[PDB]
Amino acid sequence: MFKTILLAYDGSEHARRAAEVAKAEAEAHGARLIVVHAYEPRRRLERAEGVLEEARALTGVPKEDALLLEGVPAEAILQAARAEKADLIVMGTRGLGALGSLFLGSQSQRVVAEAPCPVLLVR
Amino acid sequence: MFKTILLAYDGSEHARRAAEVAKAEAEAHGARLIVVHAYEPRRRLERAEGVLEEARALTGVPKEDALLLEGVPAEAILQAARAEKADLIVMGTRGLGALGSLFLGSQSQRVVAEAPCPVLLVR
Amino acid sequence: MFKTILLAYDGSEHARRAAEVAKAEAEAHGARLIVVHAYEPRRRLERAEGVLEEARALTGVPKEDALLLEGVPAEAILQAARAEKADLIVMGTRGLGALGSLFLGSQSQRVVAEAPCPVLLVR
Amino acid sequence: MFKTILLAYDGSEHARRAAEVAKAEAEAHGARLIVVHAYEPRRRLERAEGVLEEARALTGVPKEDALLLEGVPAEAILQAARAEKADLIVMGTRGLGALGSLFLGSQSQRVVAEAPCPVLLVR
């Protein structure tokens, strides 16, 4: 079923929970896990690589499976999921931008609206 | 992690895909799977029990684990998930009411907004 | 600008507020106001005509401007708005189905996603 | 009804349409119109004041009625709407960040979810 799982990580507490869920799902399904962190339109790259290092720490994936991407997060996630033929995307319901006002974060709404596979939302 | 999984089933093609995902997740995690179908505010009960029989067929769960509920679907799902201490809710992104116009069905939006655990959305 | 306004009415308290806003907007803009109420897939027709009579009471529109429609509410609203060349749709943020759980009701989400003109959301 | 209208402007084509609608609504209702532009967490201030100058150009409001705010746009808009006792908020359905993937932009979703008054969404 799930041979390749993609974790979208933003370093938020929701995303740290998602990382634990993604690691467990990969272990249960005998799947390859890829973690991605997008940085938006250097210092930005430094901070971003730090966030991605934490996702790699929490999930244990190899270096070629931890990717820094650029752009609107959801667009970057979807591109990587298509490129890596992900069978599941795991991401938080909300992130760093949460105010409790949206029903689901804007990047998770975008991914759920265009996802090429199931999406596991972690609160 | 996932010791109890709840599948919300409406008999839609999205929900039949979700049933396959839910069965696989239960097998992978060694989890107890519960399937629920809500009927809205008899003939209604007959049709509803038929839909639930199909969810039971597709997942193989025992009778006490296939439940007919009443009410706004999402409210019924959430009540059952709390009562059964579900660790994962699996449901389709859309259902019988799909027009392609919503970003996610209204029952899946409600469940994601108030879920007591992660939600796996199956397209 | 706004020569034709369409009010979507479901008889909810939000829709009664919307009716007052729609009447005021029509008066301010010198616009023709149409009110519509959709009934879903007789007794159903009786109840529906009652709800529409109340919208007509609250807005003062003539009979040919108060319409009963059938179908998924949002689809019916959008069809009428295109047919009547509405320049503004006025409707509540929520309705009879409100649980406080959605960010906006499912019929208002559908109309905002496909509207042929601006939409005035009344809380 | 509408004695004070607030226009949320981001300089997008949707927001230029919204500015025209807001100006017409203020003229029709004999209302005071306030325009606001939020800049996010200098050059940023320069660009932001330029965007706000365009909103002032398009609507004709006086200087004390054209405001630069800081923060998550929707939070800034809502704060200003409460402070100015707005009776209507006018804003686009989408903005500079549009990919066509969301049902409504994330700032418009936030404002509609917490608005202290009706919200007129301009496509």
Ligand SMILES: Nc1ncnc2c1ncn2[C@@H]1O[C@H](COP(=O)(O)OP(=O)(O)OP(=O)(O)O)[C@@H](O)[C@H]1O
């Ligand atoms: N830059 C990013 N890189 C990778 N994943 C991201 C990124 N941003 C968000 N995500 C994923 O999306 C999930 C949901 O967060 P999202 O950004 O949608 O909501 P938010 O930050 O609460 O609100 P906003 O819509 O203002 O961003 C995060 O938990 C994470 O899994």
Ligand SMILES: Nc1ncnc2c1ncn2[C@@H]1O[C@H](COP(=O)(O)OP(=O)(O)OP(=O)(O)O)[C@@H](O)[C@H]1O
């Ligand atoms: N009556 C129900 N009982 C159990 N699960 C349901 C029920 N209705 C919906 N669901 C679950 O919700 C999922 C998403 O469907 P949802 O009903 O949210 O969208 P829709 O039918 O496309 O639109 P609408 O918001 O008009 O119902 C379905 O695939 C199913 O998993």
Ligand SMILES: Nc1ncnc2c1ncn2[C@@H]1O[C@H](COP(=O)(O)OP(=O)(O)OP(=O)(O)O)[C@@H](O)[C@H]1O
């Ligand atoms: N049958 C209908 N006919 C005309 N307008 C309707 C109808 N149903 C809803 N509306 C319009 O949509 C507005 C928002 O209500 P909506 O039905 O979207 O939300 P809800 O009833 O709170 O939730 P649900 O998504 O469960 O219906 C109502 O205030 C009304 O203006």
Ligand SMILES: Nc1ncnc2c1ncn2[C@@H]1O[C@H](COP(=O)(O)OP(=O)(O)OP(=O)(O)O)[C@@H](O)[C@H]1O
């Ligand atoms: N910085 C801002 N200042 C004032 N109004 C804004 C600002 N950003 C957005 N808006 C208002 O919100 C409307 C809708 O745009 P919104 O920012 O919600 O969607 P988007 O830019 O398409 O997507 P994203 O959710 O990625 O921002 C804009 O047309 C404008 O009226």
Ligand SMILES: [Mg+2]
């Ligand atoms: Mg975010």
Ligand SMILES: [Mg+2]
């Ligand atoms: Mg449905």
Ligand SMILES: [Mg+2]
């Ligand atoms: Mg309703």
Ligand SMILES: [Mg+2]
């Ligand atoms: Mg419904």
Ligand SMILES: [Mg+2]
């Ligand atoms: Mg924007």
Ligand SMILES: [Mg+2]
């Ligand atoms: Mg954003």
